[PDB]
Design a protein around this ligand. Structure first.
Ligand SMILES: *C/C=C1/C(=C/c2[nH]c(/C=C3[NH+]=C(/C=C4\NC(=O)C(C=C)=C4C)C(C)=C\3CCC(=O)O)c(CCC(=O)O)c2C)NC(=O)[C@H]1C
Ligand SMILES: *C/C=C1/C(=C/c2[nH]c(/C=C3[NH+]=C(/C=C4\NC(=O)C(C=C)=C4C)C(C)=C\3CCC(=O)O)c(CCC(=O)O)c2C)NC(=O)[C@H]1C
Lengths: 315, 313
């Protein structure tokens, strides 16, 4: 039965059990994963409102100094570019990316998107023809099976992940591993099927709009935003569009129990519906840098197109 | 059918026989790169472009005996695996060579039956592609998508004119969006007859998705031999971007005052929906890595055109 979200934990909401999965408000956890930092800022003035508690250690500045400046002063070269790329009223799915040379922290990748009157800024550390070669190989795959196999093998070669799977949704939202590339010694998931509740309906809706999410370390504690609520609204900060957003504790426990230290999945979206997932596993924690993740994002789109094409060749 | 090419004493093309020019088998290439053909098994260099000596820095005869194994040691096994016998002519493999004579070359290979076609071009060596991808996806409708696409391509390439050229059901074309330098004629809103892009060109563009004329006044460079030794027949060059552009179309571009031309096919439901079409007033060799960006954009636009057309119908 579909039911509306509970309030999050920090607003006195209940703790989540197998009974009530589909009601955890997974988009507003009030916290991020510790391998990057996040700031929120007023979309018109550029006043800095919220920051992750670890921000001082990524950005090399005291909180009170950060919060006491506008983005115009903090990001003089990027602030006008942000404002042109992310105009008021734009969708929350639109992202702008730049690379910064920050004194204390080396090269940072900056990813920005806009939710209403809020700008959300994510900072992460950042670092030949493999993509072009893959694009052509995907297109020349003769059928859906060969496409799925080429796609899994390519992603594994690009990333070094212990397991890469193509997980396909059935009409009842149960899923099935239909191809996989895996490290020697791992047991096969190929052909296995999993109940529809393994990925509940508020996740599958979110995964139709925001096409890539990750858990870099399934044992890492989440880092709170400070303050936790958006001071504009005294309400929760929407983090559904932020890759740094903390993963649901229910899901991290599901993954630890499997022996997974690192998870990542790309949505494959066909005709406006979530067709399947490129799901990857690593046994140890593992951070895939932003520019490599971009390659996977591009492959997500290519695969969406090629899945349509291969399936049309099939009636 | 097709007329024989000129160099096999076929008729010269007119506007009476637009549909029958054998544009895939011109026997020549554009001079900003070099092309070798080679045997699929032996790696034996069978044809070369008369300009190969320039790019490769090799005494002419040296090449036309040697083997790819010898000539490209690191690459030759990769090719063997990447382009297995029986693969499609559409499948391409690329690498960057740090080659003694020329700082860096791009190498592009595909296979047509028993022949490997190798293309060499100068090359080199950020977020504009990722930023463009998200911009295309958040365009609210087909019109805005067209506008974003043309603007994005112009910004990435510096081309004087970028258009989105959409085919009607009878292959009548329409310029539905345009991004252009100040002080050019506007082709926005104009329609053109199907015969401007003739049927044998449209079919080839459905399979091979990017072509270009780097300089509309440059002479083609012959293949030597012109005929493939294997077959004593013309080498198919339609999957080669270095292929000499039809003189009929270079005359069409010169009369327009264009010095450089590129286009990318937008393919939807197995059919040619339209073209990203670019003009430059002067000669312009777009480097391979930037062309790759446009090739990606072509696929992304193909996806988004279907998405956007579905939310009208
Ligand atoms: C009480 C609710 C439960 C629950 C919740 C839940 N699940 C997700 C998202 C995912 N679940 C996945 C499950 C699988 N991983 C595999 O490898 C296989 C099969 C071999 C399955 C079935 C996957 C892949 C996801 C997607 C994300 C990822 O790649 O890790 C969420 C949302 C997490 C988030 O975005 O923060 C939630 C809340 N899962 C259950 O099993 C029940 C107990
Ligand atoms: C006797 C046949 C004629 C003919 C042949 C022909 N045309 C092409 C290819 C193209 N024609 C194009 C035409 C236009 N470009 C524009 O900007 C506009 C409108 C403002 C039009 C109508 C285009 C865009 C192409 C694609 C190639 C490109 O991007 O430049 C070919 C094929 C060329 C080749 O690949 O070798 C041929 C043989 N064109 C005529 O007009 C008639 C007289």
């Amino acid at each position: 039965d579909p039911l509306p979200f509970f309030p999050p934990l920090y607003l006195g909401g209940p703790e989540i059990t197998t009974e009530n999965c589909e009601r955890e408000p997974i988009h507003i956890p009030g916290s991020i994963q510790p391998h990057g930092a996040l700031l929120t800022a007023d979309g018109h003035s550029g006043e800095v409102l919220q920051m992750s508690l670890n921000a001082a250690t990524f950005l090399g500045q005291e909180p009170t100094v950060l919060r006491g400046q506008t983005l115009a002063a903090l990001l003089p070269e990027q602030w006008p570019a942000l404002q042109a790329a992310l105009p008021p009223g734009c969708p929350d799915a639109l992202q702008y990316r730049a690379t910064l040379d920050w004194p204390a922290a080396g090269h940072l990748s900056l990813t920005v998107h806009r939710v209403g009157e809020l700008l959300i800024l994510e900072f992460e550390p950042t670092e030949p023809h493999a993509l072009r070669n893959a694009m052509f190989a995907l297109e020349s795959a003769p059928n859906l099976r060969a496409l799925a196999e080429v796609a899994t093998q390519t992603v594994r070669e690009l990333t070094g992940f212990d397991r890469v799977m193509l997980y396909k949704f059935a009409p009842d939202a149960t899923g099935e591993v239909i191809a996989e590339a895996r490290r020697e010694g791992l047991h096969a998931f190929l052909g296995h099927r999993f109940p529809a509740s393994d990925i509940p309906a508020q996740a599958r809706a979110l995964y139709t709009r925001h096409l890539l999410r990750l858990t870099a370390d399934t044992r890492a504690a989440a880092v709170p935003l400070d303050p936790v609520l958006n001071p504009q609204t005294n309400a929760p900060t929407p983090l559904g569009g932020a890759v740094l957003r903390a993963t649901s504790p229910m899901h991290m426990q599901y993954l630890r129990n499997m022996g997974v230290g690192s998870s990542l999945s790309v949505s494959v979206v066909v005709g406006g519906q979530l067709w399947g997932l490129i799901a990857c596993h690593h046994q140890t924690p593992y951070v895939l840098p932003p520019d490599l993740r971009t390659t996977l994002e591009y492959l997500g789109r290519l695969l969406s197109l090629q899945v349509q094409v291969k399936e049309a060749l099939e009636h």
